[PDB]
Subunit: 132 residues, 2 copies
Amino acid sequence: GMEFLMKISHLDHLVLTVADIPTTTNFYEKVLGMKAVSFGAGRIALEFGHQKINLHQLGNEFEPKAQNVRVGSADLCFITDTVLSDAMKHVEDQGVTIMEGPVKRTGAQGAITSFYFRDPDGNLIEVSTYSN
Amino acid sequence: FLMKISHLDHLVLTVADIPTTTNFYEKVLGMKAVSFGAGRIALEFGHQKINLHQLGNEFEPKAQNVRVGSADLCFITDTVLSDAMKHVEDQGVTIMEGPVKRTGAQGAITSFYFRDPDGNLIEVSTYS
Ligand SMILES: [Ca+2]
Ligand SMILES: [Ca+2]
């Protein structure tokens, strides 16, 4: 053909490299209500909606991988359909410190309201809604 | 109360050079670079985006250990994979392997792999 238009639909998954898989899995299940799943040859992922995060253990990663794997190097913003104030209470109840929020920020689709906190490796997590 | 996440809205990539990165994702992955906020830059696709930070620039808050080349991303395309692979190859980007059978969030996928300018690993895939 001629003039093919390259187009991406969405991000299906990403790989986080973490200090300790069991710590990370427990954290995301309890704090973000994600589902830990086992797939392939004893691999672990966390499901949210219809996408997922694959976990690699630092020092035991699979190839190929990021050129420079690094714990605590991710900065992710997730949309929740729950009432944000209830989500924030839920996160705090799990013994997590809210760094900042609720505050107006920018999302892919326009204005969002967000709050922020750290995961066990120091990854920055932003939980957000498009709801007023 | 039942905590639950719908989807990922965006993530921040820390890169050596924003202009190099922009040119790559626009040409190779057909993304649109847009400005927002106070001189911030993002790459748009579907209903998501990737925010760019240049290593060394002051920003807060951010990842505890920002690192260029530390991301490992799988994108779905609705194009025929062989067309997408020809496109990428034609932009002068080395294909590492593909097409190969892999696992996506919602079942089996077919993929190919390459790296971006900083070494981030990029998997482009289809469910078809
Ligand atoms: Ca953000
Ligand atoms: Ca993958």
